[PDB]
């Protein structure tokens, strides 16, 4: 049930500073009171991160990995689409969050031109449901499914890092209270490892999923969501582990 929207416009995009955001734990090794230098796919410090304010969600490139950030409380952003051609010719990855759990699902999705999570009232079991047939017309030959606790939860900035390296799709995340909406915050906050998924697919493009609900007064009227997208680069960082094992500082060795 793909919903063709008329008068679709490009989403407004400014360019903001990343400061020292986007750092994650590169391994699952506990280190206490050390200075550890690692060379990995990191978001460079003070880089141009694109800030995206009826608007389209752009199918952005994936490059070597994607830093994603969002400051919202409306729960419009529900997940992401990953793949190369985003049709039923090659495989694709879909991450969908709702109020109870997260579904991560690799199939041969035939995605809609405008994919969105449709929130609609269901009269038979008497509550608002969410339809995944609004994002894809059909999913076939589906090789991976994974249901876990949702990671789009609590003013609070949500940060994610997505990598697709040597057969594994790695997601890192962090949720932090912030007191400003125009920019990314200063300070420093390392992203803890969230999931390592044995996917093994080709990913060159991605697209954010937004939740659109019916007005009940086209028919889907919901507010636009703003998110920050930056790109990782192969880069050497020096991370500072304090006595409890937390990355409390880092220096970018090419800055």
């Amino acid at each position: 049930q793909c919903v063709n929207f008329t008068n679709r416009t490009q989403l407004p995009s400014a360019y903001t500073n990343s400061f020292t955001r986007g750092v994650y734990y590169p391994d699952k090794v506990f280190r206490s009171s050390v200075l550890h230098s690692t060379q990995d796919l990191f978001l460079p410090f003070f880089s141009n991160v694109t800030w995206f304010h009826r608007f389209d969600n752009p199918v952005l490139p994936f490059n070597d990995g994607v830093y994603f950030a969002s400051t919202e409380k409306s729960n419009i952003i529900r997940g992401w689409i990953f793949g190369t051609t985003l049709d039923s010719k090659t495989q694709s990855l879909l991450i969908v969050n709702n109020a109870t759990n997260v579904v991560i699902k690799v199939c041969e999705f035939q995605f809609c031109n405008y994919p969105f999570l449709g929130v609609y009232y269901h009269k038979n079991n008497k509550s608002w449901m969410e339809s995944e047939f609004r994002v894809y017309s059909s999913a076939n030959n589906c090789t991976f499914e994974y249901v876990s606790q949702p990671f789009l939860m609590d003013k609070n900035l949500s940060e994610f890092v997505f990598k697709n390296i040597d057969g594994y799709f790695k997601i890192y995340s962090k949720h932090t209270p912030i007191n400003l909406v125009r920019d990314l915050p200063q300070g420093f906050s390392a992203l803890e490892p969230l999931v390592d998924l044995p996917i093994g697919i080709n990913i060159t493009r991605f697209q954010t999923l937004l939740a659109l609900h019916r007005s009940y007064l086209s028919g889907w009227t919901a507010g636009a969501a703003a998110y920050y997208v930056g790109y990782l680069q192969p880069r050497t960082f020096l991370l500072k582990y304090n006595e409890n094992g937390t990355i409390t500082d880092a220096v970018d060795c090419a800055l």
Partner: antibody, heavy 128, light 112 residues
């Protein structure tokens, strides 16, 4: 916006089944309280029966009970209504109407009772 | 069963003169939620009826602004401000509060 299409007009020997269909588009059938209204020529239209959005599912008229059966196919988004034991008075036009089950957003929604979007009517004709 | 009486049974009116259509209910149409679910429908010859006004005075999506509704309790009025050629046909008042849903007898309005 909800758009409705109907089935063909039909004739029969009396004492058999009816299957009048009503396919919705734009809004899927689970978002819509669905009602069926009979209009006779030279008479005002009267309500046969339809969905109740809360404290039950379907409600019927008192004079049509034991005859009218309404069932909904979610896969095709098609509402079907049947009625057996055709009398000669029953020859009429059968309007299919619908409304949104609720009014509002997921935040602050309230139940809506109405008769909003009416499809065209199948012409049911009992004859020789 | 709630019966709707509708007055007058017919109304001949020329072009531009406003007209009023009365609807009376044997039972008070206030619901438990607070909204009194009354609707005014218009039917053209050869055409299925379409919704003009829902909930006394709220105008449906796409209806012109020369239609207005008023009234409360058991007494309701539909006012047409400027009669044009597109308004010929039958008008019905209906409720949606107590099952079964019922309709008025309908009034006929013409040009001349």
């Amino acid at each position: 916006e909800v758009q409705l299409v109907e089935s063909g007009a039909e004739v029969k020997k009396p004492g058999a089944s009816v299957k009048v269909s009503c396919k919705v588009s734009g809004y899927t059938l689970t978002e819509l309280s669905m009602h069926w209204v009979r209009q006779a020529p030279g008479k005002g239209l009267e309500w046969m029966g339809g969905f109740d959005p809360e404290d039950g599912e379907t409600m019927y008229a008192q004079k049509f009970q034991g005859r009218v059966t309404m069932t909904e196919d979610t896969s095709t988004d098609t509402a079907y209504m049947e009625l057996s034991s055709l009398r000669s008075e029953d020859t009429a036009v059968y309007y299919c109407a619908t409304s949104t089950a609720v009014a509002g957003t997921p935040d602050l929604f309230d139940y809506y009772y109405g008769m909003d979007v009416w499809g065209q009517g199948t012409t049911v004709t009992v004859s020789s | 069963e709630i019966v709707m009486t509708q007055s007058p049974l017919s109304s001949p009116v020329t072009l531009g003169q406003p007209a009023s259509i009365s609807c009376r209910s044997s039972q008070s149409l206030v619901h438990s939620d607070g909204n009194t679910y009354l609707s005014w429908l218009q039917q053209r010859p050869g055409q299925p009826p379409r919704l003009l006004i829902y909930k006394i005075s709220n105008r449906f999506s796409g209806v012109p602004d020369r239609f207005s509704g008023s009234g409360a309790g058991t007494d309701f009025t539909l006012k047409i401000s400027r009669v044009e050629a597109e308004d010929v046909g039958v008008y019905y008042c209906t409720q949606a509060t107590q099952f079964p849903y019922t309709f008025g007898q309908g009034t006929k309005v013409d040009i001349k």
